[PDB]
Symmetry: C3
Subunit: 376 residues, 3 copies
């Protein structure tokens, strides 16, 4: 059984009867008619709504944390996947795999109507990247977000603020290991590691980059994947953040991301070598410095370079201290935020040192990344 049909040009001067259905053979679509409107009312091909993703509440993430190791996709969520429509009319549990402290997970919606989390960011176990669509994710933290201003605990659990989806996410090239601070912007949960090219900037239980262990050189700026920078200059940390589509925090972002930490307190001892782990000789455990938003070692562990300049200036003479990329003159210090392990009662979410020039490198100075919140 074949229907009446014509080209698009034939369709333009043609008014079909009310409730008549024709077939545009150029478009391979149906055209609904009303007895008056020339051309009728063409319907949409499915190819043109591929990747559709509609939420009932576009101002919030598509998922709800329902417990330390459980979460749900929200009612009213409509997802296109592999030519099919999958929607959830009520809050629906996300099938969870084994969850491991300090690991990122991707949430998929599949064309058989299921929804599940997985450590694999291409496809979940038992599916392909065609039948399964990555729609978001979360971080399973080593400990709780801070309930007050005394850090968190060491109960591994989903960080609710780390929940992202494809229309509610960090603007960074890679969303993993980030958390949403006060609904306003995203911060890296962990201080920058040396091996950020493989790990990303934000990973649990890795060696922290500072003056004594410089980050791998960015492969977007002459790095080869093996060489590290000669030191931990501001320039190098800023270059690494840019590599990953992030930036160093300014003062307003730092006081936000670090709120919840134990204030006026430092880690103590002689070092903080590793993310999400007690420092060397520490008199306070790592979790004492978790922020409200799940930022780990948010203060009192290492200074982070900031994306702000001011305070004490270098000499008023052209000074070639930029790693061979020109000279600076009356160079203001680059901000340093948070305090390090040796900084006693002076650390905290508003700790700020404006003395160190950007060319300098020290063992207790590292970095944390941030980027914008994106709501589409």
């Amino acid at each position: 059984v074949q229907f009446r049909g014509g080209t698009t040009a034939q369709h333009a001067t043609f008014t079909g009867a009310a409730r008549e259905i024709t077939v545009d053979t150029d478009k391979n679509t149906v055209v609904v008619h009303d007895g008056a409107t020339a051309g009728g009312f063409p319907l949409a091909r499915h190819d043109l709504v591929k990747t559709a993703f509609i939420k009932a509440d576009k101002s919030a993430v598509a998922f709800t944390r329902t417990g330390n190791a459980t979460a749900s996709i929200k009612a009213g969520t409509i997802v296109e996947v592999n030519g099919k429509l999958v929607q959830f009319t009520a809050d629906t549990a996300i099938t969870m795999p084994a969850l491991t402290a300090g690991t990122d997970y991707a949430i998929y919606v599949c064309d058989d109507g299921t929804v599940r989390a997985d450590s694999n960011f291409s496809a979940p176990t038992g599916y392909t990247s065609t039948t399964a669509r990555k729609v978001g994710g979360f971080h399973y933290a080593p400990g709780s977000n801070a309930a007050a201003q005394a850090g968190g605990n060491t109960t591994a659990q989903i960080n609710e603020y780390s929940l992202w989806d494809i229309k509610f996410r960090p603007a960074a090239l890679d969303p993993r290991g980030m958390t949403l601070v006060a609904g306003a912007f995203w911060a890296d949960i962990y201080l920058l590691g040396v091996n950020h090219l493989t790990d990303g900037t934000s990973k649990y239980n890795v060696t922290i980059a500072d003056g004594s262990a410089s980050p791998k050189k960015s492969t977007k700026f002459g790095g080869d994947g093996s060489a590290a920078y000669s030191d931990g200059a501001w320039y190098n940390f800023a270059e690494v953040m840019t590599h990953h589509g992030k930036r160093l925090p300014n003062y307003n972002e730092f006081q936000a991301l670090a709120f919840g930490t134990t204030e006026a307190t430092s880690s103590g001892g002689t070092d903080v070598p590793t993310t999400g782990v007690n420092g060397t000789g520490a008199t306070s455990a790592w979790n004492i410095f978790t922020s409200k938003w799940g930022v780990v070692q948010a203060s009192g562990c290492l200074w982070t370079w900031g994306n702000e300049f001011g305070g004490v200036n270098g000499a008023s003479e052209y000074t070639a201290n930029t790693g061979g990329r020109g000279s600076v003159y009356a160079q203001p210090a680059a901000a340093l935020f948070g305090g390090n392990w040796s900084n006693t009662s002076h650390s905290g979410s508003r700790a700020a040192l404006w003395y160190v020039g950007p060319s300098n490198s020290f063992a207790g100075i590292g970095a944390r990344g941030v980027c914008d919140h994106l709501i589409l």
Copy 2:
């Protein structure tokens, strides 16, 4: 009358005749065939274009101001609402309610094809949030935008630059009370009020927050909704802006948002207690300081803290002045922009004082918010 149909798997190896129409029973959709292409050409379900909102000109807002108290939705605007398609093929008047000076309004498109404004931001009178879709809004100002560089008048009217829609808007969590500066970014029309938790940051005829009347403490940072900050430190104002997804202006944004104000002029007298109202002992009326873009009390009324540091530094010693959140060292002043009532001929759109540390609090220092322009 029932049509030929099959599952999606059955459909994959099936080539129907030209102009044949089958029904995918998994998808509950129609599939158009051509006599050659295996699988045919599935059509789109309406669920997958819910919330569609298409404009002829995506680089401009969807509405035009046609007079002090009238506006229109633009030709070529196509809106999905409650399962229905509503489009306007010509500029169409927006039905207005009573308009009240210093009030924000939401524009709705309804599933009966009407379009109207309303003071209610959930649903307009005579409709529900299901049958009516909020697509944008505007601010009805107490006075005109500045036609030159001598402020505006006191004729209540729609601020054309305050027109926003869901794909042409401030990136802030709440768009109300903001205006588009030079097409580049959004600025709060009013200086921050004390009661920003209920009012938002930008409201007409409310008590201005400064050192003598500190803002309500952010409920995202330990506030309970009743307590105010101990004072008007930079830290507190920056914290409030972050609460609302905004920031303090930098120098480039300030000179932009304040252009149109009466330059090198201050309010005079002893205070400016209230937004959009003459100061105490004022020798110039409030409207003298309206910018081109409808920013009220843009200069010469209160300094606004800025999101920039530089100028005179505090002591080169760890100083615990951050409200118990750590210490600062060689702390640069936080910028102050615009000038206050007592600042005589030194106020204006480029007025900048770089002497006051962020821990300080004074009666003529408050804040104004800004965030990015978002075109989707």
Copy 3:
């Protein structure tokens, strides 16, 4: 032949048989039925997917450079245009016109299924703005991007990093003449010209704006299209960038955008009057200063004002030096980045001078614009 049909209200209490197709006469659409679901399953009108634009890889631009003067649109690209669906199942060559060094081109997808580039940004030759849809563009540069850290050559060719599309682009009001730096943000390929109102901020072979040739006054800030600023103050350059929805670079953006330039080297001689051209008395050719990302005269040619303050301060007294827009107090210098022609071995991608107040104007100080990267 007319189908069974009813209004939307009639449709709500009606359950048709499995594979029955009715016509909603309010919506002028088809409704697919299953024998159980009240209301059936309405299909989407094409009006609601107008401007649809779907890419297989949303994290990358929709086009690939295949040679100095050729490029392709990528497989999996689906485009709505003039009521029609046009998709490319394999990489497809873009038809090129004559290409001219230092020119921007727009890429169109047309409703006859073709794809082509054109110097006209409304419609390509042989088509209209209705039958042809602008989906992106590129810059055809006067020379290559830098392969190392020794600038580029003078072989005119497409700058791969200048490829933009409508969902992968600078957030600026006009994308032309910009390039994507490290996937993170966009930079103007050329230093600001005097005639930026007609040319935009970024054009090849035009007179560079500096203290000796000030930019045209912004028509958004009291300019009339003919008058230039009285001088090259920071204030004026910042105002021009804002006009175009851009900003001056900060230090982290500058070291990124200028990487690839010949470091610790200046143009020499007595001037650099023109974009993409050798300086007056130059001892190094212009192309020596091309960055990895195709930023022309990236360093060693003119300082660019930066969007950052710090270093040496002006007097601690109210100083009316803002062009009649108020006074400043303890005003920090505005950053200057890159070095100019006279700056010998001190120029480069990290060259930074923090001595000149924003009110000052000099022959070797101009500007370069940047704005955010937008992925939709």
